[PDB]
Write a protein that binds this ligand. Structure first.
Ligand SMILES: Nc1nc2c(ncn2[C@@H]2O[C@@H]3COP(=O)(O)O[C@H]4[C@@H](O)[C@H](n5cnc6c(=O)[nH]c(N)nc65)O[C@@H]4COP(=O)(O)O[C@H]3[C@H]2O)c(=O)[nH]1
Length: 247
């Protein structure tokens, strides 16, 4: 045990150089969103001859404090693809994950600003999501971070929102551009009752501030209609379109 990790933590620190990392994307179709090109970005690793999923190493990168490094790698990689798909005339928008330790990371704030500029990519195309739980904690930083990146026109949103009470509490203290609905509420509206009304106490509340909304993980047409009645701007999940490397 003392060993396997040592091989992982090394190979990772390599993909952080001349990499081995790569990104798969997932279509984010919109109903109320009417209608832009958007994909959530997902990190893949080229260990040996096959492709690794963050379920194979994110744990490691955690204890060794390499997430900041990686997630800066992810964002910079997204901003590149944005330059590429834009120099090609596509105005593709990318949803990218940012951990909590990045709210204070300047190299992040600097890697966003510089790249975003060097590719002629207007920040508006870069959407950054992160759990509300991680925000309810690393707040102060996640506070100024918002401002830092938001100034460049980027969009900062919450992932897994609506779970616990304080969910609506953070709103009056934070201020996201988009809300990725928490699965504990999403996956069940076809039957679930309180949830039916739930994504309304949320939807109808976003419309005012203009806070977009994304119900992800959708896995059936039945619930697909449900979110339209709700007024959920965007939908994501294997049922709409799985994740893939292609664009
Ligand atoms: N969020 C989301 N996922 C969907 C959906 N439909 C299918 N999935 C799949 O289910 C998995 C779980 O994603 P997760 O909860 O964010 O949990 C993720 C995440 O914690 C981590 N991860 C993967 N890529 C990245 C990345 O680029 N940045 C960061 N910070 N973490 C990543 O690895 C876990 C597994 O990722 P994957 O192998 O890519 O596998 C993903 C994804 O391919 C959907 O609508 N929404």
């Amino acid at each position: 045990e003392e060993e396997r990790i040592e091989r992982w933590v090394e190979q990772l620190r390599e993909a952080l150089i001349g990499d081995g990392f790569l990104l798969h994307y997932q279509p984010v179709l919109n109903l109320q969103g009417e209608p832009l090109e958007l994909y959530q970005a997902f990190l893949r690793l080229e260990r040996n001859g096959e492709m690794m999923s963050p379920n194979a190493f994110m744990a490691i990168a955690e204890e060794h404090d390499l997430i900041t490094e990686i997630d800066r790698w992810v964002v910079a990689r997204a901003i590149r693809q944005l330059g590429e798909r834009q120099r090609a005339g596509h105005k593709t928008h990318l949803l990218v994950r940012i951990g909590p330790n990045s709210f204070s990371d300047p190299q992040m704030i600097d890697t966003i600003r510089e790249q975003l500029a060097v590719y002629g990519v207007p920040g508006e195309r870069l959407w950054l999501q992160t759990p509300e739980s991680k925000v309810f904690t690393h707040l102060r930083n996640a506070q100024q971070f918002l401002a830092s990146v938001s100034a460049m026109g980027c969009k900062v949103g919450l992932e897994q929102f609506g779970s616990g009470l304080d969910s609506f509490q953070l709103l009056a203290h934070f201020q996201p551009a988009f809300l990725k609905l928490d699965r504990s509420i999403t996956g069940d509206i076809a039957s679930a009752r309180e949830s039916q009304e739930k994504i309304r106490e949320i939807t109808s509340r976003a419309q005012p501030t203009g806070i977009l909304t994304v119900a992800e993980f959708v896995a059936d047409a039945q619930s697909m209609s449900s979110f339209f009645t709700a007024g959920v701007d965007y939908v994501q999940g294997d049922f709409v379109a799985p994740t893939g490397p292609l664009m």
